[model samples]
Target: MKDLTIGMSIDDLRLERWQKDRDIFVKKAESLGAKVLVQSANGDDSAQISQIENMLNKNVDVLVIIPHNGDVLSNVISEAKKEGVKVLAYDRLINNADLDFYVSFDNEKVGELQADAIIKEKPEGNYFLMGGSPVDNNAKLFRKGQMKVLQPLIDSGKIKVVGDQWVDSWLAEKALQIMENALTANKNNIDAVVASNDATAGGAIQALSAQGLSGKVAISGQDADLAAIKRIVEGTQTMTVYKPITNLADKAAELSVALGKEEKLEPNAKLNNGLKEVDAYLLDPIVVTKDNIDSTVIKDGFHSKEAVYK
Candidate 1:
């Protein structure tokens, strides 16, 4: 029997989350006697597309992708299916495709976690909505989740969304610029910033810190990046959404290996991807504030005590 070969195309190596996912997946897959081939696009869609073609040429049994832009990968993945390769959509769902399986945390809930976290601090005031890339389907879903929480408040005029912006690549630097402009436009009266992820949160914090509004205004973020965790400790950020990537990575690795062996999987849920009902593994995300940082990420062993505390 040949070892199962899983080709994983990741979004960015620079991100702390993806780095941790990669490490866990490789360790677990190899332990299960599987072979894993990995590639990083560094947040470029074209690079990811090219990486998919490269994986095809290698004739890998299964392909796992962390899409930078979920919509753009649909056609390329179709070609992979034609080549008899099973494609697993990892973390971010690829819309409009006959996707085999999906492994991810409940991302909409992640957005809710972000919004709910900040809303607890500032229930009513000037709010800024900072979103991820417009092209990424996951980003859109996150915004949808966020709007679910903010919609009622906005309708009642209890919360005023002073500014809304989307970063093209979910870049921290770009988020910094958007926050700076929003602050200036709103005369620095913004109460809460609903930044989509820790990277963007870091950016928004930078802009806020420049205006001496670091801990004064509430901000919410996701990913629970080390830096973001530190910010939570220092009171610069209110909270972070902790999506345990180890669970996703381990599950994805096992799923891809099973797919390679022509084995059936029992998905916890199912979702239609504009083409077919995709077998889905949706996990829950935890909201990590200063109060529960130790209990959440640290207790789960996602981060060390020393790493997050000091």
Candidate 2:
């Protein structure tokens, strides 16, 4: 097959993990003899659609997207499909779209791990559920996994949910606002927080700190970000679900080249994307706590020991 070109449209780069994922994916894809073009929308829907259009104009063979709003991209995806461009949803599932492939971790499992970690630490308490952007399907999946674990406890009166809010754009500032409001309304009686990711956990922690509840409340996070890991060591955040980006990036790069070559691919699972059941390649997420920090992130060289300990 001729040399291939791939386009990656990401949701936002402000979230630290996206930068890592992008760099790894580009390097791997380029090493495999495919040119990669990447763009970030900063969580704007129209901006992402237009960026995809620009990539399509350049005649990319495959387009991988971490959509800001999963449901709103179907029309643009349809346009790309008609142009014979293969589409892959990266990390975040693009909903209501005829997508060719979905590459991500078991997002529902990510949620389960987050909930299980927090629940294990605080089996009975007033818990607050802080989710990511409502528009992001992955956030919903995480919440679903958390609910699967929390619902029974909630029903049995073992746990009481103090607040449930999805942060806008998964912004730390927005999460802080919600956390502050929840704290005020609940009179600072919350005991645990099921934050979907590290960024949101950081926000909730800010609020918790203000009320002097930081280390006192058990909190769960994802995306073993440097800050989040440090918090884990500092005993502020309880745990984080670590999705190794190297694995995901490598798989995405390999799959993009395969899709570009028009090779038939096999998927481990099929996920419904509102339009159809899209073929999916899913990976596992690991639970990161202070105990395994050195063995996991450090051993993988994802973060330097000096950087994390400092």
Best by lDDT: 2
TM for candidate 1 is: 0.97
Look at candidate 1 and tell me the lDDT of residue 282: 92
lDDT of 2 by residue, 1-310 (tens): 5879999999998788999899999999999999899999988889999999999999999999999998899999999999999999999899899899999999999999888888899999899999889998999999999999999999999999888899988898999999999999999999999999999899999999999999999999989989999999999999998889999999999999989888899899899987899999999999998999988999999899999986
Error of 2 at 263 (Å): 1.0
lDDT of 2 at 99: 95
Report lDDT per candidate. 0.89, 0.93
Steric clash count of candidate 1: 0
lDDT of 1 at 113: 81
Q: How many residue pairs clash per model?
A: 0, 0
RMSD of each: 1.2, 0.8
The sequence of per-residue lDDT tens digits that candidate 1 reaches over residues 260-306 is 88898989889888888899989998889899987888998888999
| Candidate 2 whole-model C-alpha lDDT, 0 to 1 | 0.93
